[PDB]
């Protein structure tokens, strides 16, 4: 499964 | 910014004339991802060609496999034609059953 994390550059 | 594709043209199984097989053109080590790959039969483009989903290596360079069913014969010539931003002219690699 994919992660469900908000990680904007 | 730009890396040229490495190309390998080969069959899925050891080739025998008259025996159905799959012709592969594996393109790798390139950047950017936009690339044109054609499989050829006697210099003419084969229409039913599929390809894998774009992926990349540890060094970020891309790879793709282009493939189609074929039947090797004594008279037919097969090749892979590659075009990319790093190439001045399309690169043609001929299929040799021994490689």
């Amino acid at each position: 499964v994919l992660n469900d994390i908000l990680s904007r550059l | 910014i730009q890396r040229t594709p490495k190309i390998q043209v080969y069959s899925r199984h050891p080739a025998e004339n008259g025996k159905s097989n799959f012709l592969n053109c594996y393109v790798s080590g390139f950047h950017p991802s936009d690339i044109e790959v054609d499989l050829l039969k006697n210099g003419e483009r084969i229409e039913k060609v599929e390809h894998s989903d774009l992926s990349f290596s540890k060094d970020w360079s891309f790879y793709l496999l282009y493939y189609t069913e074929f039947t090797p014969t004594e008279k037919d010539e097969y090749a892979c034609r590659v075009n990319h931003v790093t190439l001045s002219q399309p690169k043609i690699v001929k299929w040799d059953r021994d490689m």
Binding site: N3 | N24, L65
Partner: protein, 277 residues
């Protein structure tokens, strides 16, 4: 043996019109199991292995929502990076991301990864401790400072050591018939005269899985690298891999040369010699 789960994401901007082209692929070891392509008709995460097809609708709904959320972050990132690098809106640029986990023979956590590239060069990467960031340049330093203030690594470490590992074990069990089966290489030697006094001996390894393999030549029991050619390992197209290694030799001296094959599917390495006649 050891195992891994990895996701690869590529987003390519299309400045002339519309949103970026986005392609996502998931792998268990050397087997692709899921895909998403923004250009395809489904607009869903799709299966690419039979053992994942058994997952229910909640799985597919969840993976589709997450992969579309990854697509939107990459779209925003392309715009952010264009600004950090003071680039025009005219050219096409690429963002790549890869993340995943490695487990040992006991199926316990060994290593985690989460890294980015911009236009094919390292941008930012999670260190092996899963706590700190490696920023290649000052633009990546700006992202590092934001991610430190936001507990990003904490959430990533929890996913990489927990969720990632747990789902990998599940896939390994559901796909045991292929995923836990090693396919030893089928090996043979071919001979190609290059003249009446020299020939190429080519050592083939076909139909193997996983992709990792070593092919080496020896002459009179000593390692030989000169007059040698080794092709990159390549996919056969049926889920297995191929490789060959060749050496140019004086005709009549073939019996001094041996090819040595090492692979996870072989309890002991194989030795090949040319059969003359």
């Amino acid at each position: 043996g050891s195992h891994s789960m990895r996701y690869f994401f590529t987003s390519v901007s299309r400045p002339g019109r519309g949103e970026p082209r986005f392609i996502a692929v998931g792998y268990v070891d050397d087997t692709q199991f899921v895909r998403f392509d923004s250009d395809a008709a489904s607009q869903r995460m799709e299966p690419r292995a039979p053992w994942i097809e058994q997952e229910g609708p909640e799985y597919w709904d969840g993976e589709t929502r997450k992969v579309k959320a990854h697509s939107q972050t990459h779209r925003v990132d392309l715009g952010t990076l264009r600004g950090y690098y003071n680039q025009s809106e005219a050219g096409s640029h690429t963002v790549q991301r890869m993340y995943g986990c490695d487990v040992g023979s006991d199926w316990r956590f060994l290593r985690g990864y989460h890294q980015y590239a911009y236009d094919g060069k390292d941008y930012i990467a999670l260190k092996e401790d899963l706590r700190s960031w490696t920023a290649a340049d000052m633009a990546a330093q700006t992202t590092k400072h934001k991610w430190e203030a936001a507990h990003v690594a904490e959430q990533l470490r929890a996913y990489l050591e927990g969720t990632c590992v747990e789902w990998l074990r599940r896939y390994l069990e559901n796909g045991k018939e292929t995923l836990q089966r090693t396919d030893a290489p089928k090996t043979h030697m071919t001979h190609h005269a290059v003249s009446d006094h020299e020939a190429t001996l080519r050592c083939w390894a076909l139909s193997f899985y996983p992709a990792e393999i070593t092919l080496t030549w020896q002459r009179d029991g000593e390692d030989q690298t000169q007059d040698t050619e080794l092709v990159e390992t390549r996919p056969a197209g049926d889920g297995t891999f191929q490789k060959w290694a060749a050496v140019v030799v004086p005709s009549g001296q073939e019996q001094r040369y041996t090819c040595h094959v090492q692979h996870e599917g072989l309890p002991k390495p194989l030795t090949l010699r040319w059969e003359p006649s």
